[PDB]
Design an enzyme around this catalytic site. Sequence first.
Site, short mmCIF file in Angstrom:
data_model
loop_
_atom_site.label_atom_id
_atom_site.label_comp_id
_atom_site.label_asym_id
_atom_site.label_seq_id
_atom_site.Cartn_x
_atom_site.Cartn_y
_atom_site.Cartn_z
N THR A 28 0.84 -1.19 0.00
CA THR A 28 0.00 0.00 0.00
C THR A 28 0.88 1.24 0.00
O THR A 28 1.92 1.27 0.68
CB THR A 28 -0.86 0.00 1.26
OG1 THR A 28 -1.40 -1.31 1.47
CG2 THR A 28 -2.01 1.00 1.14
N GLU A 61 10.55 -7.02 -2.41
CA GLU A 61 10.97 -5.94 -3.29
C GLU A 61 12.45 -6.07 -3.64
O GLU A 61 12.87 -5.59 -4.70
CB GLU A 61 10.66 -4.59 -2.65
CG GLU A 61 9.18 -4.37 -2.42
CD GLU A 61 8.70 -4.86 -1.07
OE1 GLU A 61 7.66 -4.36 -0.58
OE2 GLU A 61 9.37 -5.74 -0.48
N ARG A 111 5.15 7.15 0.14
CA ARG A 111 4.52 6.84 1.42
C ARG A 111 5.53 7.00 2.55
O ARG A 111 6.74 6.84 2.35
CB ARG A 111 3.94 5.41 1.41
CG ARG A 111 3.59 4.82 2.77
CD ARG A 111 3.19 3.36 2.66
NE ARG A 111 3.53 2.59 3.85
CZ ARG A 111 3.31 1.28 3.99
NH1 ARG A 111 2.75 0.59 3.01
NH2 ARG A 111 3.66 0.67 5.11
N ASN A 999 -4.21 -8.17 4.25
CA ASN A 999 -4.40 -6.75 4.57
C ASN A 999 -4.47 -5.90 3.30
O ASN A 999 -5.34 -5.03 3.18
CB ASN A 999 -3.28 -6.25 5.47
CG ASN A 999 -3.47 -4.80 5.87
OD1 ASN A 999 -4.57 -4.40 6.28
ND2 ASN A 999 -2.43 -4.00 5.72
C1 HTL Z 1 0.56 -3.24 6.58
C2 HTL Z 1 1.45 -3.22 5.37
O1 HTL Z 1 2.02 -2.17 5.02
C3 HTL Z 1 1.64 -4.51 4.60
S1 HTL Z 1 0.81 -5.98 5.16
C4 HTL Z 1 1.52 -6.93 3.80
C5 HTL Z 1 1.24 -8.41 3.61
C6 HTL Z 1 0.45 -9.08 4.77
O2 HTL Z 1 0.14 -10.41 4.31
P1 HTL Z 1 0.39 -11.59 5.31
O3 HTL Z 1 -0.07 -12.88 4.71
O4 HTL Z 1 1.86 -11.68 5.62
O5 HTL Z 1 -0.43 -11.29 6.65
P2 HTL Z 1 -2.01 -11.11 6.67
O6 HTL Z 1 -2.36 -9.65 6.44
O7 HTL Z 1 -2.55 -11.55 8.00
O8 HTL Z 1 -2.62 -11.94 5.56
C7 HTL Z 1 2.32 -6.13 3.05
C8 HTL Z 1 3.06 -6.60 1.84
N1 HTL Z 1 2.39 -4.79 3.51
C9 HTL Z 1 3.19 -3.87 2.77
C10 HTL Z 1 4.74 -4.01 3.05
C11 HTL Z 1 5.64 -4.41 2.02
N2 HTL Z 1 6.95 -4.51 2.28
C12 HTL Z 1 7.42 -4.24 3.48
C13 HTL Z 1 8.93 -4.37 3.73
N3 HTL Z 1 6.63 -3.86 4.48
C14 HTL Z 1 5.30 -3.73 4.31
N4 HTL Z 1 4.48 -3.31 5.40
#
Ligand code: HTL
Lengths: 1165, 162
Positions: A28, A61, A111, A999
Amino acid sequence: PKQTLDGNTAAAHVAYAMSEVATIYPITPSSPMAEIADEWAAHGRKNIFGKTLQVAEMQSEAGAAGAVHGSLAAGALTTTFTASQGLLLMIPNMYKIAGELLPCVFHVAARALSTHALSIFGDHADVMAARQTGFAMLSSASVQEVMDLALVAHLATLKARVPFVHFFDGFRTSHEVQKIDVIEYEDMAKLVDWDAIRAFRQRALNPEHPHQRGTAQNPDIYFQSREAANPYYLATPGIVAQVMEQVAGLTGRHYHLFDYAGAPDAERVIVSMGSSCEVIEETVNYLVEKGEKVGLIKVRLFRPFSAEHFLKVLPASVKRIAVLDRTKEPGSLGEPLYEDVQTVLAEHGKNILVVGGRYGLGSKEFNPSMVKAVFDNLAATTPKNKFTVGITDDVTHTSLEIKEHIDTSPKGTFRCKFFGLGSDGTVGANKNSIKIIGDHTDMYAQGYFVYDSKKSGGVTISHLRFGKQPIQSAYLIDQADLIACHNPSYVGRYNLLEGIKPGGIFLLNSTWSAEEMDSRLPADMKRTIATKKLKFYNIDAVKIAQEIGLGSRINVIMQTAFFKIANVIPVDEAIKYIKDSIVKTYGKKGDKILNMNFAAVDRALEALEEIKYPASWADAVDEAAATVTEEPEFIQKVLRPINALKGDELPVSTFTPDGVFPVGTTKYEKRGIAVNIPQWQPENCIQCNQCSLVCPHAAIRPYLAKPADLAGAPETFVTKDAIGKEAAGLKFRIQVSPLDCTGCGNCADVCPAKVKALTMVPLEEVTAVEEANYNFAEQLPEVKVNFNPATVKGSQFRQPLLEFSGACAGCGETPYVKLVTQLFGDRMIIANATGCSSIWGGSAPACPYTVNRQGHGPAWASSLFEDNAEFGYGMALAVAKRQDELATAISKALEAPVSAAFKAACEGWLAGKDDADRSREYGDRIKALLPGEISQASGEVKDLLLDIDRQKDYLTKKSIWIIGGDGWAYDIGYGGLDHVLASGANVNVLVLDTEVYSNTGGQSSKATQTGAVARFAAGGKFTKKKDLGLMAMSYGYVYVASVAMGASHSQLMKALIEAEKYDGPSLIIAYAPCINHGINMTYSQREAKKAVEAGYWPLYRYNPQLAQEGKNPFILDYKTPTASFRDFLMGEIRYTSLKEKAEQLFAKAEADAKARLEQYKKLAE
Amino acid sequence: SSKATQTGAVARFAAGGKFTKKKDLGLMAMSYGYVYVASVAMGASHSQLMKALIEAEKYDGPSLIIAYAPCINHGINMTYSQREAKKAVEAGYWPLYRYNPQLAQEGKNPFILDYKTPTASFRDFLMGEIRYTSLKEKAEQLFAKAEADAKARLEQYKKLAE
Ligand SMILES: CC(=O)c1sc(CCOP(=O)(O)OP(=O)(O)O)c(C)[n+]1Cc1cnc(C)nc1N
Ligand code: SF4
Ligand code: SF4
Ligand code: SF4
Ligand code: SF4
Ligand SMILES: [Mg+2]
């Protein structure tokens, strides 16, 4: 042509046309860019090369950046989309891509970076952290500019060989919907330098003309070789200028490296970048027309910074400049753009006073009133430097004073605000309304949407604008011509009518008649309605949807009511566009559903009634406020104003300097958003406590009490005698929390009694009764019970330490974590990965983790997405060090003149400090003797005892828990998780496997099964699910277990207790149903039972301790499935939407489940 | 030190010797089923290396080749660098196998164990390299765990071949 898009779609539109490969990873607010690019490839959209874009999703990334580099070095034009923490992981590869002069474009939805706290919202912190990589940087200020400058970036990078970062403000531009001129792909290809593309192909790695790149260099040639790329950077500014002229001739819209706007003889000029330029130009027009000599310089090409192109647009009359940076570099002399402006003016001997400020961090509002404050600061005798705008900094006194409020909106612009409920259709309808007006009128249209941190039942505020002039108002609506409230519960809760224009429109959805308006509306609201002479309209959309058969969907109904009164277009034309859009939306639906939505439009027009209020409403007086309850200072000063939508008013002195928050604050929310709540039938209840076990919000719990403690109980607090030898002579009752329940219906589904002991009843009918019941149960004294915590019934008598989170109704993740706090919450520390579990677990200012009566509870911390395993690993090392420091001080006490009873507990603690029960037993013995032993000592003996007392919080052994999602465990953090498991440390890893990135909307992962359709996998995933549990078993000393609460309660209990007691690494992979699967959350528990019974999800336990006992470590807890595999897949939308090619993928999924079961049978043999 | 470092080996960042055993990279890559995995050692078998390299390139999919490469950091006479790789495989220290996913499509077992019965002494191989003799009390305790783990790994590869 004109279309209504957002910045993300505008960027992806250009990026798709110019690229062959796109390696992506979701984050996001940049993930919409990659989502729409994947769908276009799935439908066969062609780029300028006549092919579809090849989209490859990586594990992080970092992996994406490496793939970009390799794809470029091998001869393919490649782009990517990322932001914030994702851009940080690409920085190492960006140095290489820039160093090797590879043409490339990164599209960044700028962001904030995670510092003292995470923020998914927009500022330039991420882009500024890469300003030294050698990439060029191009800024877009509006959705139209995203379209144009993305083309400028893609065209310039081929000519200059310098890769570009094209960035735009996260949310403020990436999610702002605007009607813009979209550039046709055919027109772009006429501007591409095809000679430059072919030259890029010859530089590719190829065995028929080989070369070596990326060598290692000694000091003799490294300096010179780095300076050999200087001519390419010297020519880049001029190349962008010529490319900008190419786009100008095509579109008519003129861009320059730096653009000027304002009075030609201006004396005060603001230099800025991004969407702030729109707000500043709008304000500059207002001030210049009023005669003030002010101006604005928009920075487009930030790097390379061309002094020639900047000074060319600086009027000679400029005496004072204020530079605004959308970032913060703590301790730095100034922010990046301020340091550049100050430098260039010094290099040319310009005597211009320069001043820098910070604004809009994490999407902080930046409106024209603030812009004038920046301009007013330049007009002061001594302008304040290093300032802030948009906050009240009462600590360091850097904030500028917002003196007066001005309205710089161009005349003729319509402004509307829409207060909606989570997923009630309001936001979607407004998006449709913007597309209607933009496609059928000459008016410009703008839409911006404010969302809530609460996932279900949250407040959404839509900001829409339409006008005959271009809309530069990149800020929230200040003075609204129309305000609509789609939820009557907001009436009296939020300041809906704030800033509404005199004579404006107020549209309300309610069942209240004109006479009930006197008693239902608050006095302050009635005063505003009468004094401002508002046209008050009402509609009972819920009654209409019930009578038509649409249920409670009111999106179509309220949209019709809007066009009827807004007078933006002819009412007759609006009705046609709505019904025409209904065919486009409900055309694939049945013929019965189509005519229902048509009836919604027809019945809504006749049901909309204007409320003629008496003029005496202006004199109405507020009712006497009740005696406010004494709440904690944090709740009183922080949580309440934030939830009242007034957080922007809190000054700097409100917050801790390190982003630390108290625990147990969600119990003060009491949102009361449920439509139905469980009513307990005492005669049908078998006292099994499974309803408290499966509740995703801990809103239903069992309560025990001695009959003497039920003295002042209300008459409705019906109880029953407690079953069991442990609870002999006690009373039992299953009580629900009405204001915290979500209405999900899981507890009614799991109740296994002959006659259902739980039935869903509407909240309003039983709200008054159940409130007094819960308030009495909460005041019950603690009850010592000897029930075995290893059972399902016995475990639920312990207080849950995770309650009332922001997860969705019926979430499949929170029941797992709630169970852990009931077993070990007294002594555990949580390292939680970024994701849903961190959003409902740790969104300020509310904390769902709470404490028991002794004040003890889980300590919760989240670092980053990729480092969660190592984050908890470091905690384990530190906790071991803190226990080692205590054990040294206790061993010295043995040689000290202390009581014999003190020595007995100390020696007992030293012998069992590594056992949970023994350390608590002897630890509590030491705690009881500490106050008296210190009183009996003096001198050095007292100091030795005072050092033990300082460390008494480490007597009880801690239990480190590493909680995270499947995207963390299977992808970005797998390399770190693999390392923590191999180390052998006493850590507990809990993987909440939702098979998607839940999320961010539900994107593809390595945990996704074959054939499942999610974002980034429009055509379905071909490769099978990666077996994380099998790889952790290869070490042999890692405890691995696969659990599913809905399938077997006893199997989950055995694995969790065995994993925690195991003195080593433990891995718990739990299946967590989620809304992204496309199922009814009412039967979330039933969906997990069908998953295991159909062979879709295995249940096993790998116990290394069984290997030390000479037994087989692998135990298969469910060997023979009894349900049909294909029938389970058809019950979830995430598989039915694929249907074709689906039958080919379904066959592979069933064969893999038999081979996986046969593989587990061979290991069990 | 690395995760590829064996038990008891002394290197920088492992002054007291590495306690945890060597990470089994090939075993994890076989869990996908469609990844070609092969373990080779040139000093042990010239013909076995030839078969794995050609099979790996022709395989239409991912291939992973873990090759034992003697190094000066091992503390050996580099004149017998090829001989040191032969002594490693003959003592059960380094396995030789080939996991061919194409054999699974033909109904056969994908795992082929190229060296089933070791003929050299396992503990005798450790004393021939400086990276293990530098540990020399507690060293003899670590060698027994390393030798027991190597025998359990060979029995695991024989079970996978069936
Ligand atoms: C909050 C945010 O910015 C999130 S939550 C999420 C994936 C969550 O999926 P997961 O399966 O691991 O857990 P779940 O939500 O319970 O299904 C990402 C990629 N991001 C973006 C992101 C990308 N890359 C990094 C280093 N940090 C973040 N926060
Ligand atoms: S309906 Fe859902 S949220 Fe409400 S008490 Fe039952 S399980 Fe909990
Ligand atoms: S699930 Fe039903 S029977 Fe069991 S405790 Fe709850 S209400 Fe009683
Ligand atoms: S995991 Fe799914 S159900 Fe749970 S809070 Fe996140 S999106 Fe909602
Ligand atoms: S022998 Fe020399 S070149 Fe070969 S791996 Fe060892 S240090 Fe490197
Ligand atoms: Mg997930």
